[PDB]
Amino acid sequence: APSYRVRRADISGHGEEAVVNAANAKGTVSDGVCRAVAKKWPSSFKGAATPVGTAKMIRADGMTVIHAVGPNFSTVTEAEGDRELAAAYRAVASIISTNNIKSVAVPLLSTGTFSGGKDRVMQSLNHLFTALDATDADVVIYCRDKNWEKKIQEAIDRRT
Ligand SMILES: Nc1ncnc2c1ncn2[C@@H]1O[C@H](COP(=O)(O)OP(=O)(O)OC[C@H]2O[C@H](O)[C@H](O)[C@@H]2O)[C@@H](O)[C@H]1O
């Protein structure tokens, strides 16, 4: 069974074996989690392009980086977005399992640039739990907002 912790910190300072980048399909660098990952592990972006709802892994700069492309909710219906967000997290979980990754730093996919201006913390978190429950990884969830930290902690606790 996996364990779940939440850290309010820059994901680039994570102490885990692997990190999930909240990526775009083209594998370009832009504002958010993507900028911090690009600065700390710059060569992790070579050939990282991958379709929406998929993940692509690389070892570079002494780190395992998992480029997960959540949907942009401005570009899909709510139902299509929900399906694609679930897919992105399952793709991440499959990479964790197949590669025997013991611990992973994960941000909440599609909750920033890709949120279509809605609060999607719980939508994204619940897909994170569903997908990563299929692993035995130690998952550390990273956010920047104190109010999110508390909501995520409450969500973790409720599963006990
Ligand atoms: N350094 C960080 N550490 C931890 N959490 C962070 C960091 N930066 C942002 N967050 C939080 O992590 C969450 C994810 O926000 P986002 O990074 O927008 O991911 P998306 O999937 O919504 O959009 C990805 C696009 O954004 C980029 O342009 C990429 O190039 C893509 O184009 C938010 O709640 C943030 O508060």
Please state the domain extents for the chain: 1-160
Two structure tokens written together for 143: 């956010």
Decide if 64 contacts 99 (C-beta within 8 A).
yes
- The experimental technique used to determine this model is X-ray
Ligand 1 geometric centre to CA of 142 (Å): 10
- What CATH number should be reported for the domain whose range is 1-160? 3.40.220.10
Q: Residue 108, CB half-sphere, CA atoms under 13 Å: how many?
A: 23
Q: Hey, which of 33, 56, 115 would you mutate to test ligand 1's pocket, going by the most ligand atoms within 8 Å of its Cβ? A: 33
Report how far ligand 1's centroid is from the alpha carbon of 98 (Å).
25
Cα-flanking dihedrals φ and ψ of residue 24, to 5°?
-110, 165
Expressed in Å, this structure's resolution amounts to 2.0
Q: Does ligand 1 come within 6 angstroms of the Cβ of 32?
A: yes
Name residue 112's amino acid. Answer: G
Q: What angle do CA 154, 158, 160 make, to 5 degrees?
A: 130
Structure tokens at 105: 């730093």
